[PDB]
Paper text:
The bacterial flagellar motor is a huge bidirectional rotary nanomachine that drives rotation of the flagellum for bacterial motility. The cytoplasmic C ring of the flagellar motor functions as the switch complex for the rotational direction switching from counterclockwise to clockwise. The basal body is made up of the LP ring, MS ring, C ring, rod and export apparatus. Here, we present two high-resolution cryo-electron microscopy structures of the C ring-containing flagellar basal body–hook complex from Salmonella Typhimurium, which are in the default counterclockwise state and in a constitutively active CheY mutant-induced clockwise state, respectively.
Given the high fragility of the C ring, we examined several reagents as the media of density gradient centrifugation in the purification of the intact C ring-containing basal body–hook complex in the default CCW state from our previously constructed ΔfliCD strain of S. Typhimurium, which lacks the flagellar filament, thus avoiding effects of the filaments on purification of the motor. Local refinements of the LP ring, MS ring, rod, hook and export apparatus generated their high-quality cryo-EM density maps at the resolutions ranging from 3.0 Å to 4.3 Å. The MS ring is located on the inner membrane, houses the export apparatus and forms the assembly base for the C ring. In the intact C ring-containing basal body–hook complexes, there is one more peptide loop L3, which consists of the residues G310–P322 of FliF and is also extended from the β-collar region of the MS ring, bound in a hydrophobic groove that is formed by the α2–α3 linking loop of FliE6 with the D0 and DC domains of FlgC1 and FlgC6 on the surface of the rod. Thus, there are totally 11 FliF loops that extend from the MS ring to bind the rod in the basal body for torque transmission.
Author numbering:
A (entry chain E): 4 to 256
B (entry chain J): 37 to 245
C (entry chain I), E (entry chain H): 36 to 243
D (entry chain F): 37 to 243
F (entry chain G): 36 to 244
G (entry chain P): 32 to 104
H (entry chain O), J (entry chain N), L (entry chain M): 31 to 104
I (entry chain K): 65 to 104
Write the structure that this text describes.
Amino acid sequence: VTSEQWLYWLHLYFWPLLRVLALISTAPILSERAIPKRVKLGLGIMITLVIAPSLPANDTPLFSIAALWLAMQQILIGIALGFTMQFAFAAVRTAGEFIGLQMGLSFATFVDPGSHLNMPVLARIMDMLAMLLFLTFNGHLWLISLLVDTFHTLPIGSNPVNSNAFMALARAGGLIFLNGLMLALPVITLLLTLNLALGLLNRMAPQLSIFVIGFPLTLTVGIMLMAALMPLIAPFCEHLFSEIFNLLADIVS
Amino acid sequence: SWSLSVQTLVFITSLTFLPAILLMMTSFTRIIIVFGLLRNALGTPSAPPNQVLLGLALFLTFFIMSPVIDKIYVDAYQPFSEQKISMQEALDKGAQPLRAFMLRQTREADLALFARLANSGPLQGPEAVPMRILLPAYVTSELKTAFQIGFTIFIPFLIIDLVIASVLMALGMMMVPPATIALPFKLMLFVLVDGWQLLMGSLAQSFYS
Amino acid sequence: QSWSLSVQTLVFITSLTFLPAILLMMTSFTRIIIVFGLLRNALGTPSAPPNQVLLGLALFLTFFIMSPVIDKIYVDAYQPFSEQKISMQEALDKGAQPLRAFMLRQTREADLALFARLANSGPLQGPEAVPMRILLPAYVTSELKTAFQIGFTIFIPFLIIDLVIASVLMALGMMMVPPATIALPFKLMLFVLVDGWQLLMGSLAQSF
Amino acid sequence: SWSLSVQTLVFITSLTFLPAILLMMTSFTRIIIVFGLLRNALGTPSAPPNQVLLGLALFLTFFIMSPVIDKIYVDAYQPFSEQKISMQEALDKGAQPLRAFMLRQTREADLALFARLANSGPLQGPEAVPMRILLPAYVTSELKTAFQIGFTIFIPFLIIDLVIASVLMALGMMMVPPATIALPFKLMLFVLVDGWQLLMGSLAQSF
Amino acid sequence: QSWSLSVQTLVFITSLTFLPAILLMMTSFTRIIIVFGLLRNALGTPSAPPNQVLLGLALFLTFFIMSPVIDKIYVDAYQPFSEQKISMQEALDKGAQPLRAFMLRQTREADLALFARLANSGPLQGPEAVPMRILLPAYVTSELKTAFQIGFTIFIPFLIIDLVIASVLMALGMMMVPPATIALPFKLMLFVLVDGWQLLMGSLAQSF
Amino acid sequence: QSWSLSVQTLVFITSLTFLPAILLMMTSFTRIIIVFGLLRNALGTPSAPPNQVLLGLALFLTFFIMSPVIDKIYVDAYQPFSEQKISMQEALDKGAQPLRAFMLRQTREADLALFARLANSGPLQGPEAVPMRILLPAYVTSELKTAFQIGFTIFIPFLIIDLVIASVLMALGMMMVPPATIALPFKLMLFVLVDGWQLLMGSLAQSFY
Amino acid sequence: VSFAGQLHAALDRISDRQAAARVQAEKFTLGEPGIALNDVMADMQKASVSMQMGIQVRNKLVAAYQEVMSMQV
Amino acid sequence: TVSFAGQLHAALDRISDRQAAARVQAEKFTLGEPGIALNDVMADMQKASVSMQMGIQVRNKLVAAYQEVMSMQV
Amino acid sequence: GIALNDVMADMQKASVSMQMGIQVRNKLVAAYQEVMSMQV
Amino acid sequence: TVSFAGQLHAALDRISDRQAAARVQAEKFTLGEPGIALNDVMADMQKASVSMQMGIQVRNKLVAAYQEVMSMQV
Amino acid sequence: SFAGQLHAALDRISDRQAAARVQAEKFTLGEPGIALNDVMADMQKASVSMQMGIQVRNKLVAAYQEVMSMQV
Amino acid sequence: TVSFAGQLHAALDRISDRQAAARVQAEKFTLGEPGIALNDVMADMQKASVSMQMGIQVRNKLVAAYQEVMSMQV
Amino acid sequence: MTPESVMMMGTEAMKVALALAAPLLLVALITGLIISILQAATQINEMTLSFIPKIVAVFIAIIVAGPWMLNLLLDYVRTLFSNLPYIIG
Amino acid sequence: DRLDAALRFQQEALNLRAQRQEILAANIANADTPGYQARDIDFASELKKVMVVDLLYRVPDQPSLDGNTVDMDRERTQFADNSLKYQMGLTVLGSQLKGMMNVLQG
Amino acid sequence: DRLDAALRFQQEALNLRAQRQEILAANIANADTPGYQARDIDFASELKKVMVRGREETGGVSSPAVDLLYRVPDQPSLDGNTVDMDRERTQFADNSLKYQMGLTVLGSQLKGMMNVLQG
C-alpha cells in the first residue's frame, strides 16, 4: 500500500504535455508574447490533465535516446501544426504590405533596401483584422482539437515517418504568395490603371508631374479603394483558414 | 475530520498555489493582456514601469472579484472558522461561487470542445459541468476576450500612423520616419480622451456585462 | 494595548518587501521615470544615457521632492514611536497622514470618483474620508496621465526641428538624404544650449 | 563507457550548441541566405515575415538532411541499442555521414586555405579531413553557393525591372518611378510561373 | 567609537554592492560612455565596435583619469586604515574629500544652486561644506550636459562630409542616388586619417 | 610560496568569467568581426549571412590565427603546471609573455605613448618592460584603427560598381531608376566570381602577420 | 481514481491513523481497562513516522511543481 | 465586506495576544503568585511558539507569491 | 507491502527523470527561440 | 533635514556599540573582575547577535530592493 | 587541441567517479582491505571534481552565449 | 599610482598565506609536535575558513558588478 | 461579434482615417497641380520649386482644419472605447 | 482557537496529574498528623468535568489509634504511578507539538 | 534505463540490508523463546543473486526469496534456542551502520545527479 507509482504517472503526463506545449509556443494567438509564460504553461498542463488518462501510457525511460527521439517527434508535430496555421497570417501580411507599398507609403525601400526605415502599417492593420477574424471563427479551439486528434493518426510511441510530406509544408510557402496575390489582384490593378493614367499626364508637357501630384492622389485613392475592399477579406479569410486546415489534415497523416 | 497536523499541512501547501489561482482562475489574466497590448500600441514598450501596471491590475482585480470573495467568505470561510464546517468541506463550498463566476464569462464553443475532448457524456445543463471542463474553457474564453479587446484597442493608434505617413508622403518627404512623428500624437490622443478612465471603465463593464 | 515585540519584528521585516512598490506607485518615482524615458525617445537616440544613470537620478529627485513629507512622517510617527511613546499601529496611522495629503494634492477628481464608484462608496463627504485602498489607484492613474501630458509636450521642440530640417532639405532638392541623421546633432545642440537637463529638473520639481 | 553523470553533463552541454550545429554543420545558412536575397529581389523587405522564412528554411533543412538522419539512425541510433558499438566510437560513426555530406558540399580551395592556416602538411587523403579544417571551409563554401543562387534569382527580376523602365522611357515618361509599376508585374510573374515550388525543387537538387 | 569587526565587514560588503553606481555617478565613466555611443552613431555604423569593446575602453580610460584621486584616497585614507591607524568612519570621511574635490571641479554652479534651492538647504559658506546628497545629482547633471556638448561638437565633420557628398551627387543630376552609401566609406577614411580614436581619447582625458 | 588549492580554484573559476573580455581585447577577434560588420554593409545586404554565422566564422579564424600563441602558452607555461613543476602565480607570469608579444607587434607606437603619458609612467627601458595596463587599451585602439582601415579599403570595388551603374542609368535618361537595387546583384556577382570570402579571410590572416 | 483523489486518500489515511493513535492515548490516560502502554507508544511511533512521510511527499511535490512552473514556454 | 488587511490585522492580533498571555502567566509565576503551575507556563509558551511559527510560514508563502507575481513581465 | 526503501527510491528517481526532462526541453526551447529570433 | 544615510549610520553605530559592550563585558569577566555574572554576559552576547542578525536582514532586504529597482528597462 | 584537453579532463573526472563507485561496490560486498574512511574520502573527492567540472561548463557556456549575442 | 590588480593580488596572497600557515600547523600537530595545541589548530583553521569565505563573497560581488557593467547597450 | 460587425467597424475606422487625411492630401495635390500647370504655361522646369509652396499650404491646412480633425478623432476613439464592452464575444 | 482544541485534552490531563501529585505528596507529608484524613481525587471524572476539583476521602485499610488513615504503601504506589503518568503526558504533548512544528518547518 | 541501472546496485543492497535487519530483529524478539534456532542470511551471495535475477517472493502471507540459514550456536542451552545475544547485538549494530552507509551513498549519488541537472 501507499505505492503511488510515480514513473507511470510521469510517463503518462509527460509526452502529451510536450506535444501540447510545443503547439502552444508556436500556434498563433496562443504563442503571442503578451500572454504571461505561466498562463501558457498552466493551459498546457490542464489540457494534458484532461487528455492524458484516456491515452495508452508509454513506458520508455526518460534516460534513453528513445526519450530524445520521442521529444523530437512531439516538438516537430507541434511546430509543424503551429507554423502551418501561421502561414495564413503570413499571406494576409504579404497582401497588406504590397497594397501599402503600391500606396507609396514607404518609398525608401526602393532606394535603400532594408535600411531600418520601413512601416508596413497596412500590413499590420490587416494582420490584426485577420487575428480578430480568426478569434471570431474559433480557429484556436479547432487547433487544440486537431492537436488532440493527431494522436489517433500518429500515436505518442515512436512511429516511422515519410518525406515529400515535409515538402508539402515547405510547398505551402507558395500559398502565402499565391493567395496573397488573390487578395491584392483587384485593388492593385486599379491602382495600376491610376499609375497608367498618371503616365498619360506625363506624356504631356515634360516634368511638372509625378512626385508632386501623383503621390497624394494615389494615396487617397488607395485609401478609399481598400476601405471599400475591407468587406472582401472575410470570405477570403475563411478560404485561407480552410485551405490551411485541410492541408494540415491531409499531410499530417 | 483530518488531524490538526494534516489540516495545517494542507493549509500551508495550498498557500503555494496562489499565483496559479490568480492567473488561471481570476480576472487578472484578461486584466493584464490588455495592458500589455495597449503598451505595445502606444509605442512605449517600457513607459509605465511594469510593476506599475502589475499593481494597477492587482487593484483592479481586487475591486472586480469583491462579490465573489464576499460570497466565499460568508458561505465557506465564516462557517469553517467557527468550527461548523470541516476543512475538507469549506473548499468544496467555496469552489462554487468561483465556478459560477468562471461560467458567467466562459463562452460556449469552448465548453462544447472541452466536453468533447474529455469523452464525457452529454451535459444537458450547466449544472453537470465539472471543474475539469470549466477551467480550460474559462481560460480560453478569457484569452480570446482579452485579445479581442486589445485588437480593437490597437486600431486608432495604427490609424494615426497611417494618416501621418500619408500626409508626410503628400509633400514628398519620403525619408522622414513616421513613427517618430506619430508617437507624440498618440500620446496626445491617449491624454485627451481620458485614456485611462475610459479603458478602466470599459474593462470593468466588460466583466460586469 | 500594544503588539508583542516578536510581532513587531515580523511586521517590520515583512513590510520592507513592499519598498519598491511603495516607491513606484505611491511616490513621485513613476512620473519622473516616465518623463525621462519619453525624453530619451524624443532626443532621437533611444539609449544615450544608460538606464542606471537615469534610475539613480530619478531616485535622488524623488528623495528631494519627498523630503518635506519624510520630515513630517519622522516628526509625527518615527520619532515618537522609536522613543516608545506610541504603539506601532497608531504610529503607522499617524504617519499615513502627510503621505495621504501628498497623494491627494496630485490626484485627479475624476480618478478618485471612478475608483470610489467601483468600490461601492456612497456618502464620502470630507476629502478626509477617502480610504487608502481607494486613494492609491486614483493617484497612480493621475500620475500616469500627468506624465503623459508632460511627455507629449516635451516632444514638441524636437518635432519642430525634425520638420524644419526635413522641409528645408527637400525643398532645397536633396530629397534622398535621411532627415533624422542630420537632425540628431541639432537636437543635441538645442538640448545643451537651453540647459535641457537643469530646466527639465526644475520643471519636474515645480510640477508638484 | 564512462560515468552516467558525466554522460548527462556532456549531453546537456552539447544540447546548447544546437544552433551552432544547425548553422555550421547543416545547410540552413544556404536556404536562409537564398530566402533573404530573394526577398530583397522582389523589392519588399518585410512581405513574408522573418519567422516564416526561418521555419520554411527549417523544414527544407529537415528534408534535405533526412538521408543523413537515416544514415545516422542506421549507424548510431540502432547499434547503440544492440550494444555492438556504443559511446564515443558510436558517436563518431554517427557523425561520419555528416562529414561525408560536408565533404560533398565543400570546395577544395576553402579546405586548402584552412589547412595551410593550420600547418597540416601531411593531410594527404580526402576522408580524414579534421573537423577544425572542414567546418569553416564548409561554411565559406555555403556562403559562396548561396550568393550564386541569389544572383541567379536576381537575374529575371532585374530583367523585368529594366524592361519596365525601358518601356516607360520609350513611351515618353521621364518622371514615373518604374519600381511602383514593376512590383505587381514581378509578383504576377513569380506566381504565374510558380516560382516557389521550382525554387525549392532546385534547392533540393542543389544539395 | 570604532565599529566592531563584523559591522566593519558588513559595511564593506554592502558598499561593494554599490560599485556600479559609484562608477557611473562619481567617476568619469558616464561622460566617456555617452561620447563613445554618440560617436558610434555619428559614423553611420550603429554596431561596428561591439558594446563590450567600448565599455572596456571606457573603463580603462576612467581608471587612468581617476588614478590621481585613487592615489590620494590610498595615501590619505586607506593606508592608515590598513595599518590600523584610524577607524573606518574617519577613514571614509577622509576618503570622501578628494573625490568630492574632483566632482566639484567638474560641476556647474547653476546645477548646484538648483539642487540646493530644491533641497531647502541653508546658506553654505564656500565649497568646503556641501553635502554629498547635494553634490552627486548636480555632478551627474553637469556630466550629462558636458557629454552632450562634446557629442554635438563631434557630430560636425561627418555632417560636413555628408553635406558635401550629397551636394556633389545632386549637382550631377543623380536624383535617386542615396548619399549614405557613398558617405560611409569616406567617414571611415576621415576618422582613420586624423588618427581619430587616440585623438578623441586624448581629448576626453584632457577635458578632465 | 605556492597558493593553496582553494585559492587556486577560486582564482581559476573567477578568471574563467573574463573569457569574452580576453577574446575581444587580447586576441584577433576584434579586428575580424568588425570587418565583417562592415563587409555586410558594403555588399548592400545588411541581413547578409546571419549574425551567428559571422560570429562563429570569426571565432574559428581567431583560433587559427592564435594557434601559434596558444601552442607556445601550452608548451612554456601550462605543461609544467599539469606536470607539477610550476605554481599558479609563476604560470600566470610566464604564459602571458607570448600573448604580450603578439599584442605588442600589432600595437601602434602612438597609442602606446598616449596611454603611457596618461598613466604618468616612468621611462620604459624597452618593449619588454611595458605594463599590461598600458599595452591593453593601446592594443584595442590600434586594433580598431586597423579594422577601420581594412573596412574602408574593402568598401572600394562596390563603390566602383555603384558609381558605374548609376552613371550608366543616368546617361540613358533613366533618371527615376534607383541604382541600388540594380547594383546589388552585380555586387553579389563581384563577390562570387573573385571568391570574395576566401580572399578576404586569407587577407585578414596575412594582415595579422 | 485520479492523482488528486490519490493524494486526498493518502491524507485521509494519515489523518485517520493519527486520530486513532490519539484516541487510544486519551483512552489510556482515561484509565479504561484493556489498553496497554506498549500499544499506545507503538501507535504513536507509527503515527509520527506516517506524518513524516506525508511531510516529505509534500516537500518533494512542491519542489517538482516549482520546477515545472520555472519551465520556459 | 471582507478586508484582507483586516484579516491580517486580526491574525496578527491573535498571535500577539497569545504571546502576551503566555508572557504574563510567566510573569506571575516568576513573581511567586499562587495558582500558577509550571507545566501550564511551559505549555503556553510552546503554544505561543507554534503560533509564531504559523505566522512566519504564512508570511514566507505570501511574500514568495507576491514576489513571483511582481517579477512577471506583462 | 511496499516499504519506505522502495517508495523513496522510486520517488527520487521520478524526481530525477522529471528534472532531466525539464532541462532538456528548456535547452531545446532556448535553441529554437534563438533560431527564430534571427534576422535573416 | 532627514537623511536616510544618517539613519543607516545611526543604526549601524548602535549595533556596533552593542557588540563592543558585549565584547568588553566578556573580556572583563575572563580577567576575573568581581561584579560580573556569567548569565548577564551570555544574555548580552545573545542580544548582540540578535541585533547583528537584524541588521543583516535589513541590509539584505534593502540591497535586494535596490537591485530590483535599478534593473528596470527605462 | 582545446577539444582534446576538454576530453582529457572529462575522462579524468569520470575515472575518478568510476574508481570511487567500484571501491564502494567492493566494500559493500564485504571484501577485505577496503576501509570506510577511504571510501568516504574518495566519494567526496569525486563529488568535488564533478562540481568543478559543472562550474567550468557553466562559465564556458555563459561566455559562449555572451560572445554569440554581440551585434556584429 | 594605486592599481586594483596589485590589491587583488595582495589579498589573494594574504588568504593563501593564512591557509598555508593553518595547514602547516595542523600537519605538524598531527605528526606529534610538542609545542602545538589542538585549540590553536582549530581556531586557526576556522579563521582561515572565514578569510576565504570573505574572499569568495568579495569575488562574487565584483563579478556581479562587472557582468552588470559589461551588459550595457552603450 | 458577427463578421459583419467586424468588417463594419474596420470600414468605419478606415473611413475615419480617410476623412482625417483627405484635406491635407487634397490641398497638397491641388497646390502641386497648380504649380505644375503654371510651370507648363511659363515653360519653366525645375523639380524643386514645386516642393516649396506645398509645405506651406499643407502646414496652413493644420492651422485651419486641425481642430476639426482633433475633435473628430477623439470622438471616434471615445466612442470605440465606450462601445468596447458591448461588442465582446 | 483550533490550536487549543487539539492540545486541550493533554494540557488538562497534565494539569490534573500535577494537582493529584500535589495531593498525594500532601498525604505523604501529613502522615504523622493525628486526625488527618487521606484525601484524593478521581482522575477520570475530574478530567471529564474539565474537558466538558472535589476531594474524595480514601477508604481506610488499617485502623490506627490516632485517627490517621494515611497508608504508606498505597500512596507510595499511587505517587510513583502519578509520576509515570505525568512523564507520559509530557511525552505525548511534546510529540504533538513537535509534529505540528515539523509540519511548518521548511 | 541507464539511470535505473546505475542506481540499482545500492538500492538492492539497501533493500537487502532492510530485510536482514528485519531478520535480526526477529531473532532478538525470539531470544527467550524455547526451541528457536537463530536465522541469518549470507549478505554477499544473496545480493549477487538478487542482482542477476530480480527480486522474487514465496507468495504474496508473503516473504522474500532469500535463503534463511541457521547460525552455528556458541554454547548449549537447556531450553533449546541458539540466539546468543552478543552475536545478535553485534550484527544489529553492524547492519545499522551499513544501512546508514547505503543511505549516504545513494543520497550522494542522487545529489551528484541533481547537481548536473542544475543549470
